[PDB]
Design an enzyme around this catalytic site. Structure first.
Site, PDB file in Angstrom:
ATOM      1  N   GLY A  56      28.377  33.348  35.196  1.00 40.50           N
ATOM      2  CA  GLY A  56      28.337  32.690  36.493  1.00 40.50           C
ATOM      3  C   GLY A  56      29.398  31.596  36.597  1.00 40.50           C
ATOM      4  O   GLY A  56      30.501  31.760  36.086  1.00 40.50           O
ATOM      5  N   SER A  85      30.605  36.891  30.092  1.00 42.52           N
ATOM      6  CA  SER A  85      31.420  35.894  30.770  1.00 42.52           C
ATOM      7  C   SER A  85      31.073  34.492  30.257  1.00 42.52           C
ATOM      8  O   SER A  85      31.147  34.262  29.051  1.00 42.52           O
ATOM      9  CB  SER A  85      31.302  36.034  32.275  1.00 42.52           C
ATOM     10  OG  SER A  85      31.585  37.368  32.678  1.00 42.52           O
ATOM     11  N   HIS A 110      35.607  38.441  29.544  1.00 43.78           N
ATOM     12  CA  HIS A 110      36.592  38.780  30.561  1.00 43.78           C
ATOM     13  C   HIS A 110      37.171  37.493  31.146  1.00 43.78           C
ATOM     14  O   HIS A 110      36.644  36.408  30.918  1.00 43.78           O
ATOM     15  CB  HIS A 110      36.003  39.739  31.610  1.00 43.78           C
ATOM     16  CG  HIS A 110      35.061  39.158  32.616  1.00 43.78           C
ATOM     17  ND1 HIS A 110      34.419  39.986  33.514  1.00 43.78           N
ATOM     18  CD2 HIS A 110      34.639  37.916  32.903  1.00 43.78           C
ATOM     19  CE1 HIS A 110      33.635  39.263  34.307  1.00 43.78           C
ATOM     20  NE2 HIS A 110      33.755  38.003  33.956  1.00 43.78           N
TER      21      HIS A 110
END
Ligand code: A1EEF
Ligand code: A1EEF
Ligand code: A1EEF
Ligand code: A1EEF
Ligand code: A1EEF
Ligand code: A1EEF
Ligand code: A1EEF
Ligand code: A1EEF
Ligand code: A1EEF
Ligand code: A1EEF
Ligand code: MG
Ligand code: MG
Ligand code: MG
Ligand code: MG
Ligand code: MG
Ligand code: MG
Ligand code: MG
Ligand code: MG
Ligand code: MG
Lengths: 179, 182, 181, 187, 182, 186, 180, 180, 183
Positions: A56, A85, A110
């Site tokens: 997030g 992430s 990523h």
């Protein structure tokens, strides 16, 4: 949310924090609050941060990250299900030697996602900002994993899925937690 | 759209007299039509002037450059006449008219500003989009400089924000050659 | 969400910690004003700690908080964690002198006020004069609080201006980057 | 669409000019394929002119145009005006050798094909294999048309790659940048 | 839209130099009316043109496209208010050839200040405010010239919606005569 | 969203403030808000008819009738009601600010006070529009008369100064007579 | 939710019963993981009972539960009641050996994982490879838990495969049909 | 619209018949005004026939038609067929004296103008004054056309007032009920 | 967000302990049910002491309003009515329904009377039934209002044809209230 304390409150009593959702400001504020509270209860005993999160907000992630590094207690990180992430960033941010994943847990890394609209100058500012943010993330990941900034850059260009064992070899965790 | 009588809609009748009406937002459809009209008029007569009316808030830069390049490519001088408003790519095309034959009517409004755009996705995708629109702006500014006689440095400053000009100010700036008096 | 023995936020408030962890609207401002006034009543001498992780929001709601901070007797420490943008960064800079902090990877952004107006020309004029006066007010206080000239503040807030914690310190928005204990 | 005593597009078609001025879909492809075949039937020797201002679109629709171009006897000249992106830049490169043009400020963009897939793993697999084969097919033809290697095309199309007219010429996507006297007949 | 023999009714009126402004003024409407005006000038540079106005107004720039074209062309443009002329509609009514601005007895004329909008940063709001204020000054100055009223009176009288009867519009100087029955 | 306090009883923060005779008008004024504030005023009067009440105002205004429910209750009860503008008082909000006990109307330095004429709507028959117009005009006459009494400004001046949105600083609100004092730090 | 003087679910947890009675998402996984941890801490020797009435859901969320089950000391009995589909049936098979149950009319369904991908070819490739690997992982564990070959699992999960309680037992997904 | 060898409406216009068969807006008014002026130009002496089947609509658009009728030389007959309501019945009354008709079962309705206003008190005042002045204008002209007093028209239009053709004749809105 | 007083009451419950009922919303069945329940409870607590009904309401359902009206008239205690802010439509009807001599408004409070609103769609017969129903309802409201105000039914009918806004003082002269409550 079953009662015993609700179940999460009961876990917090034993110094266990559950990050089990998308990371937004609300989640970050709660986990920051829980970290500071636990430090205040006992500044020496380990804290346990469970991570099942698709990631997030980067800034919200950094709210948690900085609080972890600020407080005295070691914060163990345990990846269960998925850390993706900013979730995998926080997984890697646990106390050295105390970052874990269970055998079937997945870890994904990523590059950061964002958006910009408006004038060319505004787009430029937004672009420079997310690029600087990526450099910041990559620099810290490098320090935490032992991989070069160049490698992190290349390996996060697109979605990169890792097994628990692959995450360990990468230096994102220290140990796959065995039954 | 009224018809005149050889039965023509009014726009087709004006085109018979080498007048092209750019009277909307610039998109690919509008550009394709105007390019088609320019090429047709060149074929009809390679020497006689063409008149491009501009009442446009601008629009797509690439669509605008379709028109720009076609104007410069064809042999006829293309006069440009601002009526109502020429903004953004619209004012760029106004400035693109044959030297000495760029006009605005007295109460016409000319507005210049930097290009607008958007980008979402990965940092690298944002980077590509940013670099693209910055290069696009440099391209526009360079041509505006050549067409107006203003420095690129001045164009950059003057387009940072919305910059509204009167017809007379547009003339002083070099965007047009004359204010067309009654 | 979690409970102790108090919800977690109420537990922090017991130790004089207020959490500004959202967009600033009137509801948030009313809550924070109330907390500030309560804390003064409980203890007029002990410091208060205002955590800031906020993208900003309503200027008037921001000034509600700002004026209450300055009004009350206790020092209010500000600590930027995650992000402080716009009115959020304003409140960060409004903390007690020497007690404005950011953690090392926290982000601070400053820019000019945003707004809107529609209607008659006279109405647009009124709206424009208002937001311009509001910007002058904001810029003057930032000048006073950072030690920078109004002219520099004007230039530096013309567009979105992102600062690292260390840059925010150099700028004078904070006093110290809080290093690991 | 103005009229000339013919709508403007039909008047241009009379002079063997086809306008590809939109997103490429099956309708657009069916129209252009029909025009090409018609023009061939009118005259199998005279050149045709394909104007391209297009953001691209459907790959199968694009290949309908591509294959028809290569099938017919007449040379099809291509001229990029404004923008040729994705399948649009592919068709630009598919013009007759020596007769592919762009105007000086025209933009050419190349990138990899876009798509989607949902459902069972085996369905996702089939979709993935299909688009990967499609990309290999596009890249092979671009390689033949530009003189660039497949390896270079693959690398250069990984993300959006914007080229100037001059850059498109050196890349081999076009042959030439079309560049632009006194008289007393202006009025 | 009925046909006459083959003309649609409006095209038939255009044949007799009658242009109908019978809708909200946007760029499309302006482009049509400009085209008609230029065509009629080309047909006959000396014969009067009749501009029927039943319009609630609309875009100021679109309105000025029409206004400037009226003043530019050689033929007198008569204006005739039927039903309603509000805002930019009443501005164009007032812009007709001196002595040839008319309203029918129960026609309504309304004048008011320009409407608009702005959002974004304070600086952007300032630019938008300065722009609409300058537009209002421009409108008021021309209305002053066309009516014989002072700029200060125009300002006061357009502060809010100001409805005039045909007779009141004549007394104000927006029109020359109330056209009484044949 | 609303934290709890515990003293030697457990209170939400707002209830704790009410224990010390502080009422929060921190939202748009509607019938529900008015109902709550009226109830609080009544309760506080009953608890102590002599001790001051403090009405915090951070409000963009809202319903005029709901505003007058609060207004009339303030005037009816025996205790002085101090008003304190923090953030913003606009429209009916600034009316209620001006309604506080004489000498005890305050704003903090960067508080924004805005005055303007009442807003409304009407649709239907001409005669229905007429009724609605007469109503809102009479309502404005009522507001202005009270504002005149409360500020010491003439009705004529109030009419002029409320024709359009009129933004005042705290200090400007004082010179206007809407408040008595700009509250300085403790 | 009725109260006992505990809400009903909390009362069951007091007796080491955990109810998975919904779609599996991260929130559900988080709750069940927490309950599993808590019950281990209360007593590391006594059996835990996991009720399963679920259409399945997130594979990763299911693996959070799966791994927590295998991690803790107590045997976790699984009891299918109503339905166990997809990840639901995976977790049913994950119960302690000899202690996986279904009631007679309970439905068990197995199938291959579902997902989606959009964007560039290379992104689709990555997504495709990911779900294919996920399927290999699921099938390998199912093989170990059921005693069926990977090749058979692959075939039998190619499309929706509905099993009765009895069929589930002979497949090796459960050990016993709990009879009245 | 069927075709004759003309669309049916265009064929009727050839015989100087205008159809007002919809809600009255600016488009309808513009068309009818155009038709009226065209017919006058064709022949300034021959009668025109305006068919009215309309629920009414915009007052200003209505006055566009009204003023054009009175302006031109030819008598404009009005014939109400089906319904004439509001501004529709105003235009019915506007026909040449002696040449205003309704068919037997046609319905005529009169009522006061409708509108709206929102914003500041002074804006509401301006809108209220405006619609009240419009109603005074309508009533004055109706009085002139019908022979009824302004006071009576005010009372009779306070609410929806439905009239038969025969009642419309006694009211003075029409001259004659058109018999087979 | 309703504040609490502490023996812990929300503010409304605290007022109910002192026999104050707050009607501060649109009148619907839920609101009527609550107010009726409150009236019953208070009667049971003490059948002799006055009750206080605060009214700030734009009105609403006629039948819901009649549930309140009938309960007021049924119970032994006098129910005072105090108009604060606005009493419109059924709200003004309930204001007028207070115990004689104990109906009040504060000086700037607004009272509005008008005829009932409704709707009907379907067959002519169904429309007829609906019309007859609402006309009967208006006759019922007007008759009671006549009794409560001392105004004739004929005057009430005229004065309620359209929205009729009254000041507190005017409401007193009309007989909707007994007294304007002075500070
Ligand atoms: O690695 C550990 C170890 C492992 C241990 C040793 N004995 C029992 N468990 N640990 C501690 O050493 C102290 C705290 N703790 C308790 O269980 N404490 C007991 C308890 C009490 C009340 C509620 C829950 C748990 C655990 C937490 N974690 C991390 C952890 C976090 C979240 C989810 C997990 C899922 C699977 C494995 C680990 C998990
Ligand atoms: O700067 C400070 C200092 C830092 C300190 C010194 N000793 C411990 N911590 N501080 C105090 O000096 C007293 C109050 N306090 C407690 O922790 N008090 C203990 C406590 C008890 C119960 C619950 C939570 C905390 C802290 C609050 N803050 C601000 C602050 C706010 C929010 C989140 C933060 C995250 C990271 C750093 C700071 C944070
Ligand atoms: O490059 C060419 C060449 C060379 C040429 C001549 N003038 C400009 N360029 N060409 C021919 O040799 C025969 C056909 N033709 C005509 O113009 N024919 C005359 C004509 C008649 C009627 C309508 C339009 C054009 C052109 C078409 N094109 C391609 C072309 C397509 C679309 C839009 C373009 C815009 C700008 C330049 C080229 C364009
Ligand atoms: O002007 C005053 C004065 C000012 C005072 C004097 N000493 C301390 N404060 N006042 C009183 O004289 C008694 C009540 N009170 C308390 O603080 N009481 C103590 C208390 C106890 C428990 C919770 C909160 C407050 C205050 C309330 N207000 C009004 C007020 C309202 C809302 C928010 C405000 C923010 C900033 C300034 C004022 C504010
Ligand atoms: O396979 C054929 C054959 C063989 C052929 C191919 N090229 C020329 N001839 N054929 C005929 O033998 C008679 C009809 N015809 C004409 O072109 N006739 C000439 C003509 C005249 C007027 C308009 C269009 C075409 C073609 C149609 N098709 C099928 C066909 C359909 C649609 C699009 C196609 C695109 C590419 C190839 C084939 C296509
Ligand atoms: O500046 C010119 C000049 C100068 C000129 C002559 N009369 C008016 N202006 N010009 C020519 O020298 C030849 C073509 N032409 C005709 O009018 N041709 C006659 C004609 C015939 C048939 C239909 C329309 C016009 C004009 C077109 N324009 C540009 C132009 C475009 C659009 C709208 C305008 C509105 C106002 C002024 C200019 C406008
Ligand atoms: O007219 C009266 C009188 C007037 C009185 C006497 N002493 C103070 N006020 N009255 C009583 O005689 C007994 C009950 N009561 C209390 O306040 N009782 C004290 C109390 C206790 C607990 C909470 C609130 C109030 C009041 C209620 N009402 C009616 C009433 C209702 C609703 C809102 C109103 C707003 C403004 C004025 C009146 C209002
Ligand atoms: O009252 C009349 C009379 C009556 C008449 C005498 N002979 C035939 N009709 N009248 C004329 O005196 C000349 C024009 N006209 C024609 O019918 N003309 C013939 C015609 C030709 C082509 C198309 C339509 C009609 C009619 C029109 N009206 C008015 C009218 C309008 C609209 C619809 C109506 C429906 C019913 C009755 C009347 C109507
Ligand atoms: O004021 C005039 C003058 C004077 C005039 C003559 N008869 C009435 N008024 N005028 C001319 O001097 C020549 C052109 N013309 C024709 O009617 N020409 C005849 C004609 C032929 C073909 C179709 C329509 C009209 C008219 C147009 N107008 C303006 C006008 C516009 C639109 C609608 C109107 C409605 C009512 C009055 C005016 C109107
Ligand atoms: O008809 C009766 C009778 C007669 C009665 C009514 N008023 C006084 N006496 N009755 C009993 O004989 C015992 C129970 N009771 C109490 O009031 N008991 C006292 C009480 C205590 C605590 C809370 C509420 C009521 C009432 C209930 N009902 C039925 C009833 C139900 C609901 C709402 C009503 C509204 C209006 C009239 C009747 C209502
Ligand atoms: Mg630590
Ligand atoms: Mg040229
Ligand atoms: Mg302080
Ligand atoms: Mg070919
Ligand atoms: Mg002229
Ligand atoms: Mg008082
Ligand atoms: Mg186990
Ligand atoms: Mg006539
Ligand atoms: Mg009673």
């Amino acid at each position: 949310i079953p009662t015993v304390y609700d179940i999460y409150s009961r876990l917090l009593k034993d110094r266990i924090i559950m990050l089990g959702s998308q990371i937004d400001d609300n989640v970050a504020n709660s986990i920051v609050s829980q970290l500071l509270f636990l430090q205040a209860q006992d500044s020496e005993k380990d804290i346990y941060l469970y991570i099942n999160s698709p990631g997030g907000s980067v800034t919200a992630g950094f709210a948690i990250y900085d609080t972890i590094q600020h407080i005295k207690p070691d914060v163990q990180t345990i990846c269960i299900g998925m850390a993706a992430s900013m979730g995998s960033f926080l997984l890697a941010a646990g106390a050295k030697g105390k970052r874990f994943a269970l055998p079937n847990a997945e870890v994904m890394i990523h590059q950061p996602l964002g958006g910009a609209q408006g004038q060319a100058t505004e787009i430029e500012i937004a672009a420079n900002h997310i690029l600087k943010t990526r450099e910041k993330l990559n620099r810290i990941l490098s320090e935490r994993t032992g991989q070069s900034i160049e490698k992190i850059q290349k390996d996060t260009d697109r979605d990169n899925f890792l097994t628990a064992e692959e995450a360990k070899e990468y230096g994102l965790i220290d140990e796959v937690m065995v039954p």
